[PDB]
């Protein structure tokens, strides 16, 4: 009804580019990338959009006077004239304005710190039907204005930049019960032993197996229930609605071809029903406009998977390679138990393939120069990479001395988890390949760009 603080919301601007609507969402990446862009959700039935890089959290909402006062030094309901602080639901970095250029428009991207007037945006109405002061309503169309740059959050012609010209911004509430499911989480496919995917050294891992032991603990067995709903996508998850199963460690959507094979095919190969799934109570409403009703507990759960395009039951047959396939009736083994993962396990998994996609653009991009001279490969990113190592050093920063002994042993424990979930996925082997490919020269190529060859190697 009305937005509050600690609410998950997305921003969204619309463009009619040659009689074709695009309701494209604002999305920033974080952890190596300091700039925002757009994400298409119009073709949500034929290409999946990302969700974890576009949902925001309204951290605070103050008046302008108190904000300048603090800068000189429950839940509120937002008012058309408050100034807000939006933080990324994944990266934990606040959305702000940047002093770069891509005119007099400034570029929009995340940043670490919150102090200064950069990270604050004053809401504004955009029609005669609303005016100043009153409470925000859900589904409104509004304006965002920076405090520091004194500009509007503009969509240009796809540079999203803080400009002096306006653009509407549809907002949409996402989330707001412990132990119950919430739309968009990552969790474990427990058996009674969990579902897995094969290890490294590549098949493109496209099979699906059940395994046992500590491999479920590691970063292979992670799956994200990306629900097709736009508004209130972070509701509770009930029986009957469809949801694509996304792999988290590699980003390949589970799409059943019961005609052909069980495939984790790639991004744009997800239709509506070829990859949808649902949960049945046995093995034989329509919509809730809210955060949902409390459906599925975690330990008290025996959940039965069923495809939408076929309608059969995935059950295993008679290493541990009991590869499960769709059966018409199955056995009494499709009562799958559930358990959610943690917030640092979700954090570690997402930063693996955000970098694995980047280092392969620096292995094969540097294997393009492994010939004599091609010189046409501009896909050898330097500023996109030499920034991305500084975050992964700071991600593995050992905790300082002067700290509380109940806080160090929290920081030292979460450090050892980050070192183990990088060990199994072969990140240690994946960097040593990159030290090989750069140890061919002695300080190269066109030596105007890659003059930072030593600092990348160092």
């Amino acid at each position: 009804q009305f937005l509050r603080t600690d609410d998950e919301v997305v921003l969204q601007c619309t463009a009619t580019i040659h009689k074709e609507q695009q309701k494209l969402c604002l999305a920033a990446e974080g952890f190596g990338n300091r700039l925002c862009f757009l994400e298409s959700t119009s073709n949500s039935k034929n290409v999946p959009p990302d969700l974890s890089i576009c949902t925001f959290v309204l951290e605070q909402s103050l008046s302008v006077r108190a904000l300048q006062e603090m800068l000189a030094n429950g839940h509120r309901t937002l008012l058309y004239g408050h100034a807000i602080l939006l933080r990324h639901s994944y990266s934990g970095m606040y959305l702000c304005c940047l002093s770069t250029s891509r005119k007099l428009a400034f570029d929009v991207g995340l940043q670490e710190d919150t102090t200064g007037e950069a990270c604050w945006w004053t809401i504004h109405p955009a029609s005669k039907q609303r005016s100043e002061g009153e409470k925000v309503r859900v589904g409104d169309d509004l304006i965002l204005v920076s405090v520091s740059s004194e500009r509007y959050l503009h969509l240009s012609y796809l540079h999203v930049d803080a400009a002096f010209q306006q653009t509407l911004w549809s907002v949409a509430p996402i989330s707001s019960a412990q132990g119950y499911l919430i739309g968009g989480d990552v969790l474990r496919l427990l058996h009674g032993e969990c579902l897995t995917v094969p290890s490294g050294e590549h098949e493109q891992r496209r099979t699906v197996h059940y395994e046992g032991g500590a491999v479920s603990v590691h970063a292979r067995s992670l799956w994200r229930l990306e629900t097709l709903r736009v508004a209130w996508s972070g509701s509770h998850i009930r029986w009957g609605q469809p949801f694509r199963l996304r792999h988290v460690t590699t980003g390949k959507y589970l799409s059943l071809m019961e005609d052909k094979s069980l495939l984790l095919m790639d991004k744009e190969k997800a239709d509506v029903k070829s990859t949808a799934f649902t949960f049945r109570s046995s093995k034989e409403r329509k919509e809730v406009d809210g955060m949902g009703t409390s459906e599925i507990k975690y330990g008290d759960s025996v959940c039965f998977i069923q495809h939408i395009g076929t309608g059969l039951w995935l059950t295993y047959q008679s290493s541990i390679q009991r590869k499960a396939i769709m059966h018409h009736e199955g056995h009494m083994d499709d009562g799958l138990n559930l358990s959610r993962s943690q917030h640092e396990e979700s954090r570690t998994a997402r930063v693996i393939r955000s970098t694995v996609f980047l280092f392969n653009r620096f292995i094969r991009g540097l294997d393009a120069l492994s010939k004599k001279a091609k010189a046409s490969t501009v896909d050898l990113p330097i500023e996109s990479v030499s920034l991305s190592l500084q975050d992964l050093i700071g991600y593995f920063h050992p905790p300082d001395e002067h700290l509380e002994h109940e806080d160090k042993q929290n920081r030292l424990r979460a450090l050892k988890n980050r070192q183990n979930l990088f060990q199994e996925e072969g990140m240690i082997n994946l960097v040593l390949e990159c030290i090989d490919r750069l140890h061919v020269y002695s300080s190269v190529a066109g030596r105007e760009a890659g003059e930072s060859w030593k600092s990348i190697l160092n």
Partner: peptide, 26 residues
């Protein structure tokens, strides 16, 4: 009055090294 119309003229249009010198020839 300093803080007004420059708060307006951001939203109005009005490189400019090309205009100021080519007007000598015109």
């Amino acid at each position: 009055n300093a803080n007004v119309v420059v708060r307006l003229l951001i939203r109005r249009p009005e490189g400019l090294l090309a205009a100021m010198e080519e007007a000598i020839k015109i």
